[PDB]
């Protein structure tokens, strides 16, 4: 399944409030409905003179693995938008595999405040495209997004009661790895 063609970052998004602290998911929307299993997700990313870095970490529920990333990319004009290529590491964070060139993932943040954020991303692996993920984020987990994101979600076309609430799935998550 394509990823959506119209998604555009908020204006005026200061970025200060999006690169800081490590960010946990607690909803999220896939719209493609033969997936099966389920995941957890954690990542910090750092931002500087419009270069972007960040440490990325997924737990699948359902199997209970996980694996760990490293993306790099670069900053939009436009805004708070960046398309970045990733390398797969360890928990250490040590190169296991570096990053195919002709994959990619565009995150593009549509909402963010001090304890929580909005963000849309496609992932795509060459040619084909796995499908629009949006996922509401905040710096506790398990917290409770704020008014102003919730609203975020509205504007942006979408029902918060269609997201999956992490809380729920017995999350495990490496703190560890994403601190720092
Ligand atoms: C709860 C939220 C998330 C879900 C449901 C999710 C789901 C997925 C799925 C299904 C895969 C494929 C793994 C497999 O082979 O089975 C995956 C891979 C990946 N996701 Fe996510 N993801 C989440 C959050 C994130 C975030 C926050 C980012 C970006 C910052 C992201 C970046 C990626 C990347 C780069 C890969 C490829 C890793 C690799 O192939 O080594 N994901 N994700
Ligand atoms: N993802």
């Known amino acids: ?5 119209n998604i555009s970052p908020k204006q005026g998004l200061d970025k200060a409030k999006y690169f800081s602290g490590k960010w946990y998911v607690t909803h999220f929307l896939d719209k493609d409905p ?42 939009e004009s436009s805004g708070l938008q960046y398309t970045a ?8 964070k040590a190169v296991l595999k570096e990053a195919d060139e002709k994959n990619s993932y565009t995150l593009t943040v549509l909402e963010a405040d001090d304890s929580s954020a909005l963000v849309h991303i ?16 905040t710096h506790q987990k398990d917290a409770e997004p704020s008014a102003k994101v ?30 720092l």
């Open 85 to 92: 290529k990733y390398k797969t590491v360890d928990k250490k």
């Open 1 to 5: 399944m394509d990823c959506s063609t």
């Open 34 to 75: 033969q997936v099966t299993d389920q995941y957890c997700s954690s990542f910090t990313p750092r931002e500087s003179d419009g270069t972007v870095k960040e440490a990325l970490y997924h737990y699948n529920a359902n199997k209970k693995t996980s694996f760990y990333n490293i993306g790099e990319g670069k900053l």
């Open 150 to 179: 919730k609203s975020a979600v509205t504007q942006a076309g979408l029902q918060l009661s269609q997201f999956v609430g992490t809380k729920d799935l017995g999350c495990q998550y490496d703190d560890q790895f994403t601190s």
């Open 122 to 137: 496609c992932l795509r692996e060459g040619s084909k495209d796995l499908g629009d993920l949006y996922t509401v984020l």
